[PDB]
Design a protein around this motif. Structure first.
Motif, mmCIF file in Angstrom:
data_model
loop_
_atom_site.group_PDB
_atom_site.id
_atom_site.type_symbol
_atom_site.label_atom_id
_atom_site.label_comp_id
_atom_site.label_asym_id
_atom_site.label_seq_id
_atom_site.Cartn_x
_atom_site.Cartn_y
_atom_site.Cartn_z
ATOM 1 N N UNK A 56 0.822 -1.207 0.000
ATOM 2 C CA UNK A 56 0.000 0.000 0.000
ATOM 3 C C UNK A 56 0.858 1.260 0.000
ATOM 4 N N UNK A 57 1.899 1.281 0.834
ATOM 5 C CA UNK A 57 2.781 2.440 0.910
ATOM 6 C C UNK A 57 3.541 2.627 -0.398
ATOM 7 N N UNK A 58 4.043 1.532 -0.974
ATOM 8 C CA UNK A 58 4.782 1.623 -2.230
ATOM 9 C C UNK A 58 3.883 2.092 -3.367
ATOM 10 N N UNK A 59 2.630 1.638 -3.383
ATOM 11 C CA UNK A 59 1.694 2.074 -4.415
ATOM 12 C C UNK A 59 1.343 3.547 -4.244
ATOM 13 N N UNK A 60 1.175 4.004 -3.000
ATOM 14 C CA UNK A 60 0.936 5.427 -2.773
ATOM 15 C C UNK A 60 2.123 6.265 -3.234
ATOM 16 N N UNK A 61 3.343 5.795 -2.956
ATOM 17 C CA UNK A 61 4.536 6.484 -3.442
ATOM 18 C C UNK A 61 4.582 6.501 -4.965
ATOM 19 N N UNK A 62 4.197 5.394 -5.602
ATOM 20 C CA UNK A 62 4.232 5.323 -7.059
ATOM 21 C C UNK A 62 3.203 6.253 -7.689
ATOM 22 N N UNK A 63 2.026 6.377 -7.075
ATOM 23 C CA UNK A 63 1.012 7.285 -7.603
ATOM 24 C C UNK A 63 1.438 8.734 -7.405
ATOM 25 N N UNK A 64 1.980 9.056 -6.228
ATOM 26 C CA UNK A 64 2.401 10.425 -5.945
ATOM 27 C C UNK A 64 3.565 10.834 -6.840
#
Ligand SMILES: [Zn+2]
Lengths: 145, 49, 48, 254, 113, 44, 73, 87, 97, 254
Positions: free
Chosen positions: E68-76
């Motif tokens: 979840x954290x990595x996906x949020x970083x990837x979207x941001x």
């Protein structure tokens, strides 16, 4: 039915918080909220209470409660930033009672119960505050009739 | 149309929040991610554009 | 000591608070300094 | 001298930290002892744990068996101070039993609040007297000669707060009509502070209302040159706006 | 005018509070919870045959402490979404089966885990 | 976690009365304890 | 050379490096760029109060060092 | 649960990590070097004024004065909006 | 039309003015039916002051120059012996709702 | 001479920095320790740390033995002055035990405050006498033979303060009708300081008040051409208002 105030209703929602005495210290209802701008806390009272009749929106400060302290492990980056800007000696935490998401209303009442006064309170807590927000909801899309 | 649905402003803003933050940073309406988050939570008109 | 530290890189007796010297066994109490999520995977047993 | 109550204990943190019992000074002790006293004082009598006190005094790298050092510092405080003024709670220490006006920081906070209230009420003489009393509190640099990252953070914060206090004080001085002293002391401060833009804007508005113009725009040109040399950017638009409205000779300020 | 007001029914979430016993999001409107993707929804997505959307709705958008954290970083940051990992509830199931005296062990092609 | 150096480790060998031998990682600056609890049987 | 012309129009007056007199005179009128002064005609800056012929000569030499000239000149 | 890491907090921390190096590189190389040797950053332990005066070889007063100058430069409002909201 | 008001001793539209039988929301409803004409493009403040028992209507209001009320028979509120009403009604000009 | 108390230690920083005891000067010695003594004296009893003292005195690049040099200068002053005057606190050096009116700057500030109070009370002659006594304390150039950049900043500050005191005394003298010495003083200072425009405005007021008109217009034209040649702004609205009131022969000014 919108302009003539035919299908509209007052909705009053109550929402409360309590300043307790945890293990680290006593939670304080105070105006001096850290890490926040002055315009956010503009409508608060001297003891940290939103005034009666103050229009309030989502995310706004209702009553200012700060937790006494937390295990502090500042990162060298945040330590260097702290040196540039400076921070509060108390290092209290922002846990004030805010408005829930997507809520607009007018504050119509605040009730304060104090342990130091004659008011009876549950064990552990030092004081308690309740705020009522009232909104005059008109009729809109999705409202079931 | 048959392929369209109508989402409210608040619901679509909350679903697409990180995409809106990235686009706000790209279109230099916010200095960084924290400022973009503050603008999204405040709900300004440029956020809705 | 059995299930890992409840904190991050800390231990029971209060020593070894930092992150740099991670993955060591504290001599005072035996708590290995690591992440708290280790408590989601580390188990023990009872001898009957 | 009018508030010198019998049995009153006064503490000094806005400059070099000190203890005063009924008018006589006490030997505070070592610089780390002084910094521990300051850390226990600025929390307004809140209980600070021993580990947090260690973090405030020493930071990231403490020696292993030096909790007893904080223990003996607290014992030396209880030697110098009253047995009951410093209380031990949950393994930490808190300086309690402090009356009003005992701490100079609290006195400065109250004086600033009263000055802001009189600004809201429009009283000029009363708030001027309140700020005169406020400026007579700190002696020299705040927290003189004490180590620690908490001490450094308090030093820089209180220096910045003193800077905004001077800004508000002298903005009020320009509002009431004190030209000469304001020009002199702000010339001294901007000589001491080369890159403080707010004080230089105060110099611009003060000199525009004092009959002096050449050294004002000379200081402004030096400000732009130094801000371009040291930063490579443009100054704040308010400074340019006030300089432009000065250039058109607007009689509103005069 | 009924009390099924639209101001109370509407609720949305991108990332909010997460549950404790299992790391999926919790539920409800007041606590910023996520909608439940039940078993019949998963049946519908298998009937479409969309493996990737189902996998990301089961492993990325919940139940992964690091995905979840990595996906949020990837979207941001604008980069592509990272590959999904292993859901936490499967690990909790393995741990609960192991404490019932069952030697439930995962096997790779070469060997064990 | 990017660029952090772990404190130097030494693997100290502990043997119990029942014959179980095991290695425990300690720091170099650390004081090595002569006594430990056996990972296999819990003995001295 | 178009980028060079854009740069010669874009830089502020502070890089023009002349005396404080003519600089203050042009900044009073609102001129803050070289291109703004270029777009003005000769009568525009000979209508400036307290702007003598020495100021005009100094400004002309200043722009002559930069290789550009006035309007209608 | 409070132990769950917020994705927004981790993103903000990573952006702070990227932005602080950039604003350090905005300054001069020597000033950025002495700041990174003085207040944590590159090296976990923050070396004191005495502990850096051997590898660089000046007085206590000179290194203290340039450190104060770097603090005043970083306190200027120009290099503030990129880090004020990072807290 | 009237676009905003201000009642002395009242902070929001959910209180009651001491001495009137109609709460402030009913006052909003009664003001919303008051038809007015405002020559000024800028908003104009009209004043309504009533003391003692009686029936406050639109004929009891004080319209400034350029602003005129057109239904003086519209009843606004009632007042008993200890009733006292002071409102400063802001009137503006526009179209629609 | 009426305040020459026995055993009183006085200091002079308004001119050459000196120490006097019972009317007899003390051996100040080197200009460097004179600068240190002035730096301690000019803070009005506020404590100063050793590091800030070094930064103020030697500028940006001190040599390798700054702390020991400051320590031995303080020790030399300790032999020169009283042991109880110079004290060491929190690693810094401060001057304590200062009597009221012994410092020339503090006495001048007190006399200026008394003169301001008298002017607010309407007593012009008493205020003139008090600030004349204060202005008599300036012994020529401020900080004679005092090196250091902080010395230059303090020289600028005290010179501006003295010029403003002369300016207000001059306007008070013009209001009192004593224009005879005022014209000579104004001409001397405008020859010395052409840069000050408020002083030239007071000179123009004196020119119009005493009764000559054409050469006053020559003075105004000189100010205008100086402003155009050096800086180039139009005359300020206050100066233009005074000029047009003078041209219209206003009986209120005369
Ligand atoms: Zn331990």
């Amino acid at each position: 039915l919108v302009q003539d105030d035919v299908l509209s209703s007052i909705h009053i929602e109550e929402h409360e918080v309590d300043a307790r005495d945890t293990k680290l210290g006593p939670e304080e209802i105070t105006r001096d909220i850290p890490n926040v701008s002055e315009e956010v806390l503009a409508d608060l009272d001297e003891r940290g209470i939103i005034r009666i009749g103050a229009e309030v929106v989502a995310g706004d400060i209702l009553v200012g409660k700060v937790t006494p302290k937390g295990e502090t492990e500042l990162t060298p980056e945040e330590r260097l930033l702290r040196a540039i800007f400076g921070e509060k000696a108390r290092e209290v935490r922002d846990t004030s009672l805010k408005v829930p998401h997507g809520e607009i209303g007018k504050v119509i009442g605040v009730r304060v119960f104090d342990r130091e006064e004659g008011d009876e309170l549950p064990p552990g807590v030092n004081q308690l505050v309740r705020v009522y927000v009232a909104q005059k909801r008109k009729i809109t899309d999705g409202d079931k009739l | 149309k048959l392929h369209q649905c109508g989402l409210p402003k608040a619901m679509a803003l909350e679903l697409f929040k990180p995409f809106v933050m990235k686009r706000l940073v790209d279109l230099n309406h916010a200095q960084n991610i924290k400022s973009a988050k503050r603008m999204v939570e405040r709900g300004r008109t440029v956020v809705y554009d | 000591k059995i299930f890992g530290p409840t904190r991050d890189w800390e231990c029971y007796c209060g020593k070894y608070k930092r992150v740099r010297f991670k993955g060591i066994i504290c001599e005072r109490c035996g708590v290995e300094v690591t992440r708290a999520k280790v408590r989601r995977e580390r188990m023990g047993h009872i001898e009957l | 001298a009018e508030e010198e109550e019998s049995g009153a204990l006064r503490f000094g943190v806005l400059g070099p930290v000190r203890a005063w019992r009924d008018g006589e000074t006490l030997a505070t002790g070592s610089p780390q002892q002084r910094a521990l006293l300051a850390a226990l004082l600025l929390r307004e009598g809140r209980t600070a744990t021993a580990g947090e006190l260690i973090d405030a005094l020493w930071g990231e790298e403490p020696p292993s068996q030096a909790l007893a050092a904080v223990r003996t510092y607290a014992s030396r405080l209880r030697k110098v101070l009253d047995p009951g003024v410093l209380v031990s709670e949950s393994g930490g220490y808190a300086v309690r039993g402090l009356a009003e006006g005992a701490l100079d920081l609290a006195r400065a906070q109250d004086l600033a609040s009263a000055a802001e209230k009189a600004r809201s009420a429009g009283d000029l003489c009363h708030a001027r007297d309140l700020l005169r009393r406020a400026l007579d509190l700190w002696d020299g640099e705040v927290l003189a000669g004490v180590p620690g990252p908490y001490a450094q953070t308090q030093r820089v914060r209180l220096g910045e707060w003193r800077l905004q206090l001077l800004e508000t004080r002298l903005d009020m001085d320009l509002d009431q009509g004190c030209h000469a002293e304001a020009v002199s002391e702000l010339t001294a401060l901007t000589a001491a502070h080369p890159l403080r833009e707010r004080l230089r804007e105060l110099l611009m508005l003060a000199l525009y209302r004092s009959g002096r113009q050449a050294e004002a725009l000379a200081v402004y040109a030096d400000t732009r040159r130094l801000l371009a040399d040291e930063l490579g950017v443009d100054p704040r638009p308010g400074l340019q706006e006030l300089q432009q409205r000065i250039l058109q000779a607007d009689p509103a300020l005069a | 005018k009924l009390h099924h007001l639209v101001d109370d029914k509407l609720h949305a979430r991108s990332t909010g509070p997460y549950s404790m016993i299992t790391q999926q999001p919790l539920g409800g409107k007041a606590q910023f919870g996520g909608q439940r993707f039940g078993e019949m929804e998963v049946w519908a997505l298998e009937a479409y045959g969309a493996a990737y959307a189902l996998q990301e709705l089961l492993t990325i958008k919940s139940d992964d402490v690091t995905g979840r954290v990595k996906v949020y970083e990837a979207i941001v940051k604008g980069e592509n979404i990272p590959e999904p990992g292993i859901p936490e509830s499967f690990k909790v199931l393995i741990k609960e089966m192991q404490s019932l005296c069952l030697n439930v062990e995962v096997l790779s092609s070469d060997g064990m885990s | 976690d990017r660029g952090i150096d772990l404190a130097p480790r030494q693997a100290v060998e502990y043997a119990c009365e029942k014959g179980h031998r095991f290695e425990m990682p300690f720091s170099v600056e650390a004081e090595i304890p002569p006594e430990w609890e056996c990972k296999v049987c819990g003995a001295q | 050379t178009d980028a060079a012309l854009a740069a010669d129009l874009a830089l502020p007056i502070e890089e023009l490096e002349l005396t404080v007199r003519s600089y203050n005179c042009l900044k009073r009128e609102g001129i803050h760029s070289v291109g703004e002064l270029v777009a003005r005609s000769e009568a525009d800056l000979l209508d400036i109060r307290n702007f003598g012929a020495k100021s005009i000569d100094e400004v002309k030499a200043k722009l002559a060092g930069m290789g550009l000239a006035l309007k209608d000149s | 649960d409070s132990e769950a890491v917020v994705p927004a907090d981790a993103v903000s921390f990573t952006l702070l990590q990227e932005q602080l190096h950039s604003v350090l590189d905005t300054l001069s190389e020597r000033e950025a070097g002495v700041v990174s040797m003085r207040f944590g950053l590159t090296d976990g332990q923050p070396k004191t004024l005495d502990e850096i005066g051997k590898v660089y070889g000046v007085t206590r007063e000179r290194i203290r004065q340039i450190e104060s100058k770097t603090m005043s430069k970083l306190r200027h409002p120009s290099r503030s909006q990129v880090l004020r909201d990072y807290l | 039309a009237v676009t905003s008001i201000r009642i002395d001793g009242v902070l929001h539209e959910f209180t009651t003015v001491p001495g009137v039988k109609e709460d402030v929301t009913d006052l909003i409803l009664n003001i919303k039916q008051l038809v007015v004409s405002s020559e000024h493009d800028e908003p104009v403040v009209m004043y309504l002051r009533k003391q003692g028992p009686g029936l406050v209507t639109a004929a009891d209001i004080a319209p400034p120059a350029g602003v005129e009320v057109h239904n003086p028979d519209l009843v606004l509120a009632t007042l008993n012996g200890k009733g006292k009403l002071e409102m400063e009604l802001t009137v503006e000009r526009g179209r629609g709702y």
